[model samples]
Target: ENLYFQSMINSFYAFEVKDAKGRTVSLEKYKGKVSLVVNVASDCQLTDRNYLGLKELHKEFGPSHFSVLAFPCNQFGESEPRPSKEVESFARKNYGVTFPIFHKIKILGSEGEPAFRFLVDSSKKEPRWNFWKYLVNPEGQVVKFWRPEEPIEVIRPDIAALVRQVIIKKKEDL
Candidate 1:
């Protein structure tokens, strides 16, 4: 039994993140749901693809058993220079994104946001660019992650599986 191996892993719900208005909101509100958390940017060439793909996923499985949480970041190529409030508006106007977009934050290094830090720490893979995606299960553990270069279609089945799990468990409790 390795003591280090048994060290507690923090759940995704255990983190608090800033809302677009600068209010501190606990990610605990997303508990009991599968989440696809992504570091988003408005000006990245991949923006159209990622935001549309994310919108598709959110529409299919979100605000219910699944939710897509977007966090805007400017660290990569300064692609997301707009204010936090405008980030969500732009995504909605251009991409029809209806998922929750949070306040802007650093996604890596010493000043990385705590929630994102937990995500990278758990996956052992920090984002090298914008649009990196992390899939979190209903229990709030990070199930896996996909780089920005990785298409969302490749991660669809994994999201479906987790959503199914949530549905089945809900029915079982009835």
Candidate 2:
């Protein structure tokens, strides 16, 4: 097993974050895919641009080698004050987001989810506001992180590079 796997019993792939319907969503499904995790907000000022960029990324590198997992959060100024189901619903209705939006989870402080705690603990980057992004590699490591102000164009190459490596490696195996 890799260091990340052996480092902790709660390795990234071993954890299953819950979706809106109380269903478990295994991160293992995205094992060989480059994944991006973002803390999303429904009423934030940055939602418009962030969701558009996220949806575009989902469309561009979707269904195989990439997963953009957005998790709704309300701790930052109550931007997404709704409950789990309503949170996802508002995002779908208003943002037209087709990506996976997990149930609300804390990405900051001690009350954070295990997956996010690992993410922040690894990157040393705490999300200050809504739409904070973290780009994760195929091997369940945080590659890089971006604040809301960083445009998707700034991060696309990072993803494209990983996609080329991981997808090619996966295809070769198949």
Candidate 3:
């Protein structure tokens, strides 16, 4: 039954996205990896904390199987006004962010990206602002939702636990 859910979730791999260079990035590339999906705003107050926390999390689990993917959006107070290049540069230069950032996207209301739309419309959780986060298992299931105010460090244990479960499950399957 769990595998069935995973397969169903995998069908969302068809959603397409672009990278900072405008290159096509397929969601399928992350199919078997634990993913932390976040909506970011470059100028938002939470940018600093979230970026640093994301970096810390990446450092801890990146090589082992975890990946963080950020999507910049300006829906709230027009906080993210930069182009893709600027956004990417800001993340690297200011925050030392090394995680993958998808092309700028809309994260709320009717203008939301297709992938986010699927997440919001299909899932029980809804994002409230520019820094909302969703934690996805390696199998593509969304295991938890973190609001903008939730400290990333506070969420780390849950992520670590999920990672362990995913590893164990994969080992069993093998």
Candidate 4:
């Protein structure tokens, strides 16, 4: 069981998440970057705060080494109310979010994305709400996660540590 699950979940870079246009975009594009992945909802009460934190982090972290990758999910309360076609622009205009926010996907149950499955498998935890954040390493594995109530400040040190590890010398160092 251990070996099978490890083999199944370890190849994080191999997992592809669907974009808003129903395209099967590859996850290989995220290789070498420490990803801060979040399941977001435009209409979630806490989405504003999530975007604000991501905006600041996006400015401070930048995309070359560290990045924010959001996945919009309307699974809860129809939280991300925007139509699939308009969600990206709406977030950019309303929240000033510059990070990549992918299509609204199922975050729970049997049909969840492979990336989410990997995160849950690794972290051994499931997201209870819309603003759940998954801080993934350069390898594409989930290193840790935070609840909707938790802010970026609480996890900045760990983020900095991972970024620092990846920053030193090269991605190979990580």
For TM-score, the strongest prediction is: 1
**Cα lDDT of all candidates, in order?**
0.90, 0.84, 0.80, 0.80
lDDT of 1 by residue, 1-174 (tens): 888887475699888899887999999989999999999999989988998899999999988899999999999999999999999889888887778899999986779998898898899989888998999988889989998888777989999988998999989986
lDDT of 2 by residue, 1-174 (tens): 776677664345557899987798888887878888899988888888888898889889886888898888888998988789988888789878788989888876778898887878788998899988898888788879998889988989998888889878986886
In candidate 1, the residue pairs with backbone N, CA or C atoms under 3 Å apart (3 or more residues apart, or in different chains) clash, namely none
Give the alpha carbon lDDT tens digit for every residue of 1-174 in model 4.
676565655756677877877778887888888888888888878878888888888778767888888888888888887776588888888877777878778879888887777887888888888888788888877778888888788967778888888888484553
Angstrom error at residue 104, model 1: 0.3
Query: After superposing candidate 4, which stretches have Cα over 4 Å from the reference?
Result: 2-6, 171-174
Candidate 1 yields a Cα-based lDDT of 0.90
- Number of clashes recorded per candidate: 0, 0, 0, 0
How well does each candidate superpose onto the true structure, as a TM-score? 0.93, 0.91, 0.87, 0.90
Error of 2 at 22 (Å): 2.0
Model 2 deviation from native, Cα RMSD in Å: 2.9
Q: Show model 1 residue runs off by greater than 4 Å.
A: 1-9
If the candidates were sorted by their TM-score against the true structure, best first, what order would they fall in? 1, 2, 4, 3
lDDT of 1 at 153: 73
Candidate 3 weakest lDDT stretch, 10 residues: 5-14
lDDT score, residue 7, model 4? 69
Could you tell me which residue pairs clash in candidate 3? Answer: none
**Global fold similarity of model 1 (TM-score):** 0.93
